[PDB]
């Protein structure tokens, strides 16, 4: 009861009523999912947690599906002010609900527990996204020409699809398989902002599919019941949603690297063998296969050899490499959890009184929605992604079932008789092969002699027919077809800037 | 010089025909007479005159194997001529009775003959560098003027 005045006299009244507006929105929204049920307005009842706050922020700020107000974000002068308004009001809503969190303490509502640093990470995430879209604002933002206009991802990425690295490395990168394992680790650190150790710890068994999403690539990284602490929960959840660009897609890169790793060239690149998966145990084989390998078959390749790799590549594309900023940890990272809320909040039956459960929409398969789309370099502003029907020429499965057909055998094998992770990984691989054949014609369009095309079954005119399908206007068009990057569209969809990316035969 | 010949006596002295068979001064010079350095830099390569002072310094290192600390010790009048030549640019070196020892001589004579390749010709490159250092571009690069020569007595201003 001592908390009266210093709560009250903490603020300007103007501040207090802006905060009152914001928590009034919060209360109405919790009644909109009847969390507080239906003026019915107590204080020792209203739950405050970082995910609750966060999902309120989702449902109000970012959820611009909203067809009455759909396309303010398209106009540059509207969005350039609108997102600044978003982030300012974001910070104010954070302060408001922090104030309300302290308010529930003086009423003694134990249901209010903040963990601001999670919401600080939300703040930092949206801050970095708006600063990314802000630094990209103009060709002549300042007197720069092409290096503001040089994404360190794509200039590397596209130039890694070349079957030759002649000035670069005959010492290192003869094989395209080594180029693809480099591109795999680079798109790891690109999409999944991690450390070298965190890049090391990917078995195949921690690579799952979207439950409510079909497209999520779940790396359900959990502390294994012992760091100093049992009850294993430190949950780090990640995703590799594909890219409309067929050359920075993680799924395309992954399917390509695993094709060369498993099958490769039938003469030259004799693969590592498509795995057993028959008397596999859940945890036996997929929990042994590294996502990438060198000479060893189980562990992860050598650290300073990767340092050499990144050094050679960033001197090839002439970019400032700094080793801490890829091998050591950043803080621009993914959400982190307990066991407590993770089991508690994602259980629907504890919240089954509600009209909706947040696992459905704003948490696509236990992922905070902006931590999905920002890390996958997307404007996070629909909550209702329906871009999946955008598919000129969906590829035929008869071409698909040529490579990796053992998967098709395994589901015509005793599908029960295989381990649970195994067939789930098999369906993962089929989605990978689908995305692979989908993105294949531009790979043929730009490097027709990759080691994938050291296989004349692809040289047959069924694949070439599908190549002429997807690359149909490519010879006649001045510009490209596929998407680029949210602030690099009007530069590199031009074929010429796209060819300035190439150094060896544009 | 036999080492130069030994590297040059076979085009398969080194199996690559890509970078290892290029002589070092030539690769630097030809990609340093380029105006644009777009993949390279502008933050340490603003002007073409910054590129020229880099290129003149590297050609000094290439022809006259000094330290940069010894390339510090070159003035305008530190450069004489082969008077039987008009070809060499004579750095006549200083040990004049107090920098190492009395009874002066520890001297060293340095030749800077031109090259028929004008990209690596050091006389050409220094002429261009001092042209743009002094006169500059008549529209943009405000050079710092032709030397005075009038206040210079021997060992006073050019030195």
XYZ file of C-alpha atoms in Angstrom:
665
model
C 0.000 0.000 0.000
C 3.068 2.175 0.000
C 3.012 1.964 -3.816
C 0.286 4.558 -4.199
C 1.786 7.902 -5.016
C 5.032 6.936 -6.732
C 2.908 4.856 -9.047
C 0.569 7.790 -9.585
C 3.100 10.599 -9.637
C 5.453 8.538 -11.823
C 4.052 10.031 -14.981
C 2.558 12.886 -16.818
C -1.226 12.577 -16.991
C -0.888 12.665 -20.781
C 1.377 9.648 -20.465
C -1.124 7.944 -18.182
C -4.010 8.371 -20.558
C -2.048 7.206 -23.569
C -1.224 4.140 -21.514
C -4.879 3.908 -20.531
C -5.849 3.899 -24.185
C -3.396 1.110 -24.832
C -4.355 -1.163 -21.975
C -7.996 -0.452 -22.761
C -7.270 -1.895 -26.196
C -5.615 -4.805 -24.415
C -8.602 -5.454 -22.168
C -11.024 -5.316 -25.076
C -8.813 -7.685 -27.027
C -8.650 -10.167 -24.162
C -12.419 -10.049 -24.130
C -12.304 -10.599 -27.891
C -10.801 -13.951 -27.076
C -12.814 -13.930 -23.789
C -9.663 -14.275 -21.689
C -11.173 -11.861 -19.314
C -14.795 -12.911 -19.827
C -17.596 -10.418 -20.369
C -18.416 -3.298 -17.437
C -16.767 -6.525 -16.294
C -13.272 -5.328 -15.339
C -11.347 -6.715 -12.312
C -7.637 -6.535 -11.529
C -6.506 -9.750 -9.795
C -7.544 -11.792 -12.814
C -6.018 -10.278 -15.918
C -3.070 -12.367 -17.127
C 0.034 -10.560 -18.316
C 2.795 -12.546 -19.930
C 5.226 -11.733 -22.696
C 3.499 -13.982 -25.182
C 0.112 -12.511 -24.259
C 1.430 -9.002 -24.764
C 3.163 -10.250 -27.866
C 0.117 -11.832 -29.404
C -1.851 -8.678 -28.651
C 0.856 -6.774 -30.524
C 0.487 -9.265 -33.324
C -3.293 -9.059 -33.514
C -3.289 -5.269 -33.482
C -0.131 -3.834 -35.027
C 1.237 -6.166 -37.683
C -1.930 -8.029 -38.766
C -2.431 -6.035 -41.951
C -4.439 -8.584 -43.840
C -7.340 -6.153 -43.364
C -8.807 -5.612 -46.865
C -10.404 -2.268 -45.970
C -6.911 -0.946 -45.193
C -4.818 -3.434 -47.159
C -2.323 -1.386 -49.153
C -1.024 1.589 -47.229
C 2.243 -0.401 -47.045
C 2.642 -0.391 -50.849
C 3.053 3.394 -51.142
C 6.569 4.473 -50.189
C 5.538 7.769 -48.574
C 2.638 6.124 -46.749
C 4.642 3.121 -45.498
C 7.766 5.174 -44.716
C 5.696 7.093 -42.182
C 3.398 4.184 -41.300
C 6.117 1.819 -40.090
C 7.718 4.581 -38.038
C 4.276 5.075 -36.533
C 4.139 1.302 -35.976
C 7.416 1.168 -34.102
C 6.740 4.300 -32.057
C 3.340 3.028 -30.993
C 4.989 -0.342 -30.469
C 7.363 1.120 -27.908
C 4.517 3.001 -26.271
C 2.370 -0.116 -26.028
C 5.355 -1.862 -24.462
C 5.643 0.886 -21.874
C 1.889 0.857 -21.291
C 1.735 -2.820 -20.637
C 4.831 -2.645 -18.489
C 3.000 -0.002 -16.485
C -0.046 -2.253 -16.314
C 2.176 -5.117 -15.211
C 3.329 -3.036 -12.297
C -0.296 -1.995 -11.741
C -1.425 -5.592 -11.340
C 1.233 -6.066 -8.671
C -0.248 -3.410 -6.423
C -3.626 -5.082 -6.807
C -1.589 -8.285 -6.292
C -2.441 -10.121 -9.473
C 0.123 -12.962 -9.518
C -0.962 -13.792 -13.080
C 1.138 -10.836 -14.324
C 4.767 -11.710 -15.105
C 6.545 -9.722 -17.783
C 10.048 -10.897 -18.837
C 10.738 -7.620 -20.621
C 13.891 -8.955 -22.294
C 11.808 -11.214 -24.508
C 9.763 -8.202 -25.471
C 12.998 -6.259 -25.758
C 14.043 -8.857 -28.296
C 10.748 -8.279 -30.089
C 11.555 -4.589 -30.068
C 15.050 -5.219 -31.374
C 13.694 -7.497 -34.084
C 11.202 -5.002 -35.419
C 13.760 -2.247 -34.944
C 16.279 -4.045 -37.080
C 13.666 -4.790 -39.717
C 12.643 -1.167 -39.983
C 16.278 -0.105 -40.051
C 16.969 -2.662 -42.763
C 14.098 -1.348 -44.832
C 15.252 2.186 -43.990
C 18.878 1.841 -45.059
C 17.702 0.278 -48.321
C 15.587 3.364 -49.111
C 17.251 4.734 -52.266
C 19.848 3.995 -54.918
C 21.160 7.439 -54.030
C 20.494 7.248 -50.316
C 23.948 8.805 -50.298
C 26.497 9.014 -53.122
C 26.907 5.194 -53.164
C 26.165 3.324 -56.380
C 26.075 -0.462 -55.915
C 27.283 -1.458 -52.420
C 24.281 -0.227 -50.547
C 22.779 -2.157 -53.449
C 24.918 -5.226 -52.691
C 23.199 -7.798 -50.474
C 25.948 -9.891 -48.862
C 23.612 -12.848 -49.118
C 22.782 -12.766 -52.806
C 26.091 -11.598 -54.303
C 27.624 -14.585 -52.557
C 24.673 -16.893 -53.110
C 24.184 -16.593 -56.865
C 27.922 -16.629 -57.490
C 28.117 -19.903 -55.573
C 25.852 -21.593 -58.120
C 28.570 -21.324 -60.761
C 30.065 -24.728 -61.659
C 33.481 -23.029 -61.831
C 35.393 -20.978 -59.255
C 38.509 -20.696 -61.367
C 40.211 -17.628 -59.922
C 38.632 -18.429 -56.558
C 39.692 -21.925 -55.522
C 40.959 -24.928 -57.267
C 42.571 -25.374 -53.838
C 39.219 -25.663 -52.083
C 36.241 -25.665 -54.396
C 36.749 -28.086 -57.245
C 33.624 -30.023 -56.307
C 30.219 -28.427 -56.466
C 29.333 -30.463 -53.372
C 31.775 -28.430 -51.309
C 30.295 -25.291 -52.841
C 26.885 -26.467 -51.731
C 27.948 -27.327 -48.195
C 29.446 -23.847 -47.969
C 26.207 -22.375 -49.282
C 24.313 -24.474 -46.743
C 26.291 -23.051 -43.832
C 26.065 -19.570 -45.322
C 22.294 -19.772 -45.607
C 22.281 -21.144 -42.110
C 23.947 -18.027 -40.722
C 21.972 -15.901 -43.175
C 18.481 -17.117 -42.332
C 19.076 -18.757 -38.966
C 21.189 -16.181 -37.173
C 23.438 -18.412 -35.113
C 26.939 -19.328 -34.047
C 29.374 -21.884 -35.465
C 28.561 -24.223 -32.595
C 24.871 -23.654 -33.196
C 25.449 -24.426 -36.843
C 27.271 -27.574 -35.760
C 24.430 -29.114 -33.796
C 22.021 -30.068 -36.569
C 21.309 -33.735 -36.947
C 18.655 -34.785 -39.435
C 16.345 -35.859 -36.620
C 15.734 -32.264 -35.512
C 14.362 -31.231 -38.928
C 10.595 -31.414 -39.008
C 7.579 -30.136 -40.925
C 4.852 -27.568 -40.459
C 2.012 -28.994 -38.411
C -0.492 -26.204 -39.065
C 1.770 -24.772 -41.711
C 3.129 -27.610 -43.957
C 6.052 -25.299 -44.754
C 7.834 -24.816 -41.445
C 11.267 -26.332 -41.055
C 11.337 -26.857 -37.312
C 14.738 -27.044 -35.688
C 13.334 -27.824 -32.262
C 16.550 -27.155 -30.380
C 16.004 -28.041 -26.725
C 18.489 -28.181 -23.877
C 18.678 -31.925 -23.246
C 17.483 -31.966 -19.609
C 20.925 -31.029 -18.251
C 22.642 -27.697 -18.402
C 22.569 -27.222 -14.660
C 18.930 -28.028 -14.749
C 16.475 -30.834 -15.424
C 12.907 -30.313 -16.836
C 14.477 -29.727 -20.232
C 12.862 -26.516 -21.406
C 15.015 -24.070 -23.261
C 13.190 -24.139 -26.544
C 14.610 -22.462 -29.604
C 12.361 -22.685 -32.619
C 13.432 -21.854 -36.142
C 12.117 -22.025 -39.683
C 13.261 -22.236 -43.297
C 10.207 -21.050 -45.205
C 11.237 -21.017 -48.863
C 12.150 -18.070 -50.992
C 10.598 -16.986 -54.272
C 14.136 -16.395 -55.427
C 15.344 -19.833 -56.609
C 18.927 -19.103 -55.557
C 18.696 -18.007 -51.940
C 16.015 -20.538 -51.050
C 17.119 -22.691 -48.106
C 14.919 -25.523 -49.258
C 16.315 -25.516 -52.793
C 19.897 -25.280 -51.525
C 19.222 -28.067 -49.055
C 17.681 -30.386 -51.633
C 20.547 -29.676 -54.036
C 23.265 -30.322 -51.465
C 21.592 -33.504 -50.300
C 21.176 -34.705 -53.880
C 24.889 -34.263 -54.538
C 25.737 -35.683 -51.120
C 23.522 -38.718 -51.529
C 23.551 -39.477 -55.247
C 25.646 -36.864 -57.022
C 27.102 -37.472 -60.450
C 26.671 -41.204 -61.243
C 30.263 -41.331 -62.479
C 32.217 -38.684 -60.608
C 30.394 -37.629 -57.453
C 29.491 -41.016 -56.023
C 27.287 -39.948 -53.135
C 27.421 -40.787 -49.441
C 24.558 -43.241 -49.876
C 20.893 -42.603 -49.398
C 20.427 -43.789 -45.816
C 19.071 -47.041 -44.402
C 15.868 -45.863 -42.659
C 14.604 -49.466 -42.414
C 15.536 -50.694 -38.942
C 16.185 -47.091 -38.012
C 15.307 -46.140 -34.482
C 13.968 -42.694 -33.669
C 17.261 -41.198 -32.599
C 19.431 -43.802 -34.281
C 20.359 -42.620 -37.745
C 18.788 -39.213 -38.365
C 20.224 -38.195 -35.000
C 23.634 -39.122 -36.339
C 23.704 -37.631 -39.826
C 25.267 -34.178 -39.848
C 23.567 -31.605 -41.969
C 26.949 -31.277 -43.671
C 30.207 -33.163 -43.533
C 33.747 -33.119 -44.837
C 35.760 -36.316 -44.662
C 34.032 -37.561 -41.514
C 30.584 -39.087 -41.793
C 29.043 -38.108 -38.477
C 30.532 -34.915 -37.070
C 30.694 -31.384 -38.344
C 33.476 -30.000 -40.578
C 36.515 -28.135 -39.375
C 36.100 -24.675 -37.912
C 38.979 -22.693 -39.331
C 38.539 -24.411 -42.676
C 35.177 -22.684 -42.660
C 37.078 -19.538 -41.683
C 39.154 -20.077 -44.811
C 35.962 -20.687 -46.778
C 34.310 -17.459 -45.664
C 37.570 -15.559 -46.121
C 37.983 -16.762 -49.703
C 34.368 -16.134 -50.548
C 34.057 -12.673 -49.058
C 37.237 -11.733 -50.811
C 35.753 -13.136 -54.010
C 32.635 -10.966 -53.732
C 34.818 -8.258 -52.135
C 32.924 -7.917 -48.886
C 34.152 -7.087 -45.370
C 34.367 -10.409 -43.575
C 34.442 -10.274 -39.802
C 34.719 -13.623 -38.073
C 32.868 -12.760 -34.860
C 29.889 -11.660 -36.949
C 29.376 -15.136 -38.331
C 31.023 -17.613 -35.970
C 30.384 -15.916 -32.666
C 26.927 -15.233 -31.352
C 24.815 -12.252 -32.258
C 21.881 -11.029 -30.219
C 19.571 -10.621 -33.218
C 18.256 -14.039 -32.380
C 15.261 -16.308 -32.057
C 12.885 -16.606 -29.079
C 13.841 -18.643 -26.061
C 11.537 -20.408 -23.660
C 11.179 -22.335 -20.430
C 9.533 -25.689 -20.052
C 6.864 -23.938 -18.043
C 5.118 -21.567 -20.453
C 6.100 -23.739 -23.400
C 3.960 -26.568 -22.091
C 1.569 -24.173 -20.426
C 0.730 -21.593 -23.051
C 0.768 -23.917 -26.059
C -1.636 -26.289 -24.337
C -5.015 -25.346 -25.720
C -7.045 -27.066 -23.010
C -5.749 -24.738 -20.303
C -7.093 -21.901 -22.436
C -9.932 -23.911 -24.037
C -12.508 -21.431 -22.774
C -11.277 -19.003 -25.419
C -12.839 -18.398 -28.805
C -9.472 -19.050 -30.424
C -6.204 -20.606 -29.548
C -3.084 -18.660 -30.511
C -1.321 -21.792 -31.704
C -3.506 -21.509 -34.815
C -2.783 -18.200 -36.444
C -0.221 -15.908 -34.920
C 1.920 -18.754 -33.743
C 2.588 -20.816 -36.854
C 3.673 -24.082 -35.271
C 4.996 -22.510 -32.056
C 6.814 -19.713 -33.860
C 6.349 -16.025 -33.082
C 5.145 -14.762 -36.392
C 7.543 -11.895 -36.975
C 10.451 -14.055 -35.818
C 9.408 -16.232 -38.690
C 9.020 -13.616 -41.387
C 11.737 -11.107 -40.472
C 14.393 -13.791 -40.203
C 13.037 -15.086 -43.503
C 13.255 -11.498 -44.797
C 9.577 -10.792 -45.241
C 7.273 -7.931 -44.422
C 5.417 -9.539 -41.540
C 2.164 -7.758 -42.246
C -0.599 -10.222 -43.193
C -0.885 -13.076 -40.623
C -2.776 -14.798 -43.456
C -0.109 -15.907 -45.933
C -1.909 -17.358 -48.973
C 0.860 -17.053 -51.575
C 0.965 -20.828 -52.129
C -1.291 -20.780 -55.194
C 1.167 -18.474 -56.930
C 2.638 -21.244 -59.061
C 2.950 -20.949 -62.796
C 3.581 -24.546 -63.910
C 3.478 -26.772 -60.829
C 5.969 -29.504 -61.691
C 4.884 -33.084 -62.392
C 5.604 -35.835 -59.906
C 6.672 -38.226 -62.658
C 9.799 -36.130 -62.977
C 9.960 -36.023 -59.162
C 9.816 -39.793 -58.612
C 12.885 -40.277 -60.809
C 15.370 -39.133 -58.189
C 15.028 -40.315 -54.602
C 12.379 -42.947 -55.451
C 13.250 -45.061 -52.407
C 11.179 -42.596 -50.408
C 8.244 -43.576 -52.598
C 9.140 -47.172 -51.836
C 9.259 -46.536 -48.071
C 5.636 -45.423 -48.000
C 4.854 -48.476 -50.126
C 7.061 -50.437 -47.728
C 5.689 -51.030 -44.245
C 5.171 -47.358 -43.450
C 4.421 -48.476 -39.898
C 7.595 -50.593 -39.844
C 9.909 -47.578 -40.044
C 10.755 -45.246 -37.164
C 8.550 -42.203 -36.622
C 11.211 -39.593 -37.367
C 12.233 -41.536 -40.465
C 9.072 -41.234 -42.553
C 8.566 -37.684 -41.320
C 12.037 -36.894 -42.645
C 11.080 -38.719 -45.829
C 8.091 -36.443 -46.322
C 10.410 -33.527 -45.537
C 12.693 -34.749 -48.308
C 9.758 -35.034 -50.693
C 8.831 -31.433 -49.993
C 12.495 -30.607 -50.609
C 12.476 -32.472 -53.912
C 9.283 -30.672 -54.899
C 10.851 -27.286 -54.200
C 13.975 -28.533 -55.947
C 12.226 -29.370 -59.200
C 10.191 -26.182 -58.826
C 13.286 -23.986 -58.655
C 15.247 -26.173 -61.073
C 14.528 -24.280 -64.368
C 16.241 -21.084 -63.329
C 19.206 -23.125 -62.131
C 19.321 -24.606 -65.602
C 18.708 -21.157 -67.081
C 21.731 -19.625 -65.435
C 24.134 -22.548 -64.972
C 23.035 -25.326 -67.315
C 26.143 -27.363 -66.614
C 25.997 -27.838 -62.887
C 26.739 -31.295 -61.481
C 22.975 -31.790 -61.141
C 22.953 -31.647 -64.928
C 25.658 -34.274 -65.080
C 22.665 -36.586 -65.384
C 21.061 -36.770 -68.848
C 17.713 -37.910 -67.475
C 17.422 -34.204 -66.714
C 18.845 -33.634 -70.175
C 15.753 -35.339 -71.544
C 13.164 -32.977 -72.961
C 10.580 -33.659 -70.257
C 12.671 -31.640 -67.821
C 13.669 -29.326 -70.675
C 9.968 -28.966 -71.451
C 9.357 -27.897 -67.857
C 12.407 -25.644 -68.192
C 10.842 -23.965 -71.206
C 7.643 -23.803 -69.166
C 9.085 -21.848 -66.264
C 11.587 -19.852 -68.351
C 8.965 -19.132 -70.997
C 9.253 -15.358 -71.374
C 12.803 -15.254 -69.989
C 14.448 -14.753 -73.370
C 12.005 -12.006 -74.336
C 11.612 -10.251 -71.018
C 13.813 -7.285 -70.101
C 13.536 -8.109 -66.426
C 13.421 -11.186 -64.233
C 10.330 -13.069 -63.095
C 10.894 -14.128 -59.507
C 11.027 -11.953 -56.407
C 14.266 -10.468 -55.184
C 14.241 -8.937 -51.677
C 11.791 -6.507 -50.047
C 13.906 -3.470 -50.867
C 15.935 -4.854 -53.773
C 13.108 -5.606 -56.172
C 13.418 -2.546 -58.403
C 17.172 -3.074 -58.773
C 17.867 -6.747 -59.375
C 14.677 -7.812 -61.074
C 16.424 -6.021 -63.891
C 18.464 -8.736 -65.574
C 21.445 -6.440 -66.018
C 22.033 -5.705 -62.336
C 21.395 -9.411 -61.879
C 24.266 -10.000 -64.300
C 26.510 -7.534 -62.472
C 26.257 -10.105 -59.680
C 27.976 -12.571 -61.977
C 31.669 -12.145 -62.716
C 32.224 -15.338 -64.727
C 30.172 -15.198 -67.975
C 27.141 -12.925 -67.234
C 67.446 -12.201 -62.467
C 67.919 -15.897 -63.062
C 65.027 -16.318 -60.616
C 62.916 -14.068 -62.819
C 64.031 -16.106 -65.800
C 63.325 -19.339 -63.944
C 59.795 -18.234 -63.188
C 59.470 -17.111 -66.805
C 61.306 -19.959 -68.587
C 58.146 -22.041 -68.643
C 54.527 -21.045 -69.077
C 54.031 -24.158 -66.969
C 56.479 -22.901 -64.371
C 53.229 -22.589 -62.443
C 50.340 -24.694 -63.723
C 47.709 -21.952 -63.448
C 47.399 -19.557 -66.340
C 45.211 -17.337 -64.145
C 46.924 -15.270 -61.422
C 50.288 -16.836 -60.595
C 51.753 -16.083 -64.026
C 51.015 -12.432 -63.622
C 53.883 -10.196 -62.530
C 52.998 -8.318 -59.350
C 53.630 -4.728 -60.413
C 51.648 -5.148 -63.611
C 48.492 -6.504 -61.956
C 48.542 -3.620 -59.500
C 49.196 -0.957 -62.112
C 46.686 -1.995 -64.757
C 43.902 -2.345 -62.204
C 45.048 0.938 -60.662
C 44.771 3.032 -63.791
C 41.082 2.149 -63.748
C 38.946 5.108 -62.642
C 36.227 2.980 -61.056
C 37.062 0.637 -58.154
C 33.517 -0.431 -57.544
C 34.071 -3.891 -56.137
C 37.252 -2.622 -54.499
C 36.679 0.548 -52.460
C 36.106 4.250 -52.358
C 36.515 4.740 -48.595
C 40.255 4.371 -48.927
C 40.163 5.150 -52.665
C 38.233 8.392 -52.976
C 40.189 10.136 -55.699
C 42.162 9.001 -58.659
C 44.984 10.967 -57.026
C 44.693 8.782 -53.919
C 45.027 5.851 -56.295
C 48.011 7.629 -57.825
C 49.805 8.199 -54.539
C 49.191 4.529 -53.766
C 50.510 3.543 -57.176
C 53.572 5.797 -56.988
C 54.366 4.447 -53.512
C 54.014 0.863 -54.683
C 56.196 1.535 -57.727
C 58.801 3.050 -55.437
C 58.717 -0.157 -53.416
C 58.873 -2.178 -56.639
C 61.854 -0.389 -58.182
C 63.680 0.910 -55.102
C 63.451 -1.702 -52.382
C 63.238 0.619 -49.386
C 61.185 0.751 -46.276
C 58.241 3.125 -46.253
C 60.231 4.715 -43.447
C 62.995 5.151 -46.003
C 60.534 6.141 -48.711
C 59.728 8.940 -46.275
C 63.139 10.431 -46.972
C 62.551 11.527 -50.567
C 62.122 15.204 -51.314
C 61.650 16.890 -54.684
C 65.339 17.644 -55.094
C 66.267 14.137 -53.917
C 65.964 13.137 -57.587
C 68.784 13.793 -60.027
C 69.368 12.587 -63.565
C 71.752 10.408 -65.416
C 73.400 13.358 -67.078
C 74.917 10.994 -69.608
C 71.434 9.465 -69.776
C 68.437 11.693 -69.110
C 66.917 8.298 -68.280
C 67.405 7.448 -64.611
C 65.988 9.353 -61.689
C 68.858 9.486 -59.267
C 68.136 9.110 -55.606
C 71.538 10.065 -54.243
C 71.512 8.710 -50.721
C 72.402 10.563 -47.515
C 75.076 9.573 -45.111
C 76.646 13.033 -44.891
C 78.943 12.958 -41.848
C 76.193 12.869 -39.214
C 73.446 10.395 -39.693
C 75.412 7.174 -39.165
C 78.971 8.325 -38.646
C 81.530 10.994 -39.483
C 83.806 10.570 -42.580
C 80.536 10.657 -44.425
C 80.140 7.905 -46.986
C 77.476 5.292 -46.747
C 75.785 6.237 -49.975
C 73.585 4.455 -52.460
C 72.706 5.227 -56.060
C 69.230 4.502 -57.346
C 68.042 4.218 -60.951
C 64.530 4.789 -62.288
C 64.673 4.128 -66.031
C 61.330 4.332 -67.872
C 59.335 1.339 -68.987
C 57.907 0.941 -72.489
C 54.791 -0.166 -70.700
C 53.574 3.253 -69.524
C 51.264 1.708 -66.948
C 54.281 0.540 -64.956
C 56.641 3.281 -66.181
C 57.477 5.063 -62.910
C 58.490 8.305 -64.580
C 55.105 8.373 -66.334
C 53.219 7.603 -63.134
C 55.054 10.179 -61.051
C 54.519 12.782 -63.783
C 50.786 12.063 -63.733
C 50.636 12.052 -59.938
C 52.390 15.387 -59.585
C 50.317 16.826 -62.435
C 47.074 16.023 -60.653
C 48.569 16.866 -57.253
C 49.563 20.306 -58.428
C 47.214 21.338 -61.217
C 44.491 18.747 -60.789
C 41.283 18.521 -62.744
C 40.500 22.065 -63.972
C 36.838 21.554 -62.991
C 36.765 19.416 -59.801
C 40.099 18.242 -58.363
C 41.504 21.436 -56.895
C 45.179 20.541 -56.958
C 47.626 22.136 -54.585
C 49.558 24.178 -57.104
C 52.784 24.067 -59.089
C 55.815 24.397 -56.772
C 57.164 27.797 -55.810
C 60.873 27.267 -56.743
C 61.611 30.832 -55.622
C 61.816 30.517 -51.855
C 63.811 27.319 -52.397
C 67.462 27.821 -51.876
C 69.507 24.599 -52.047
C 68.297 22.394 -49.225
C 65.579 24.746 -48.030
C 62.128 24.237 -49.536
C 62.369 21.527 -52.193
C 64.248 19.495 -49.573
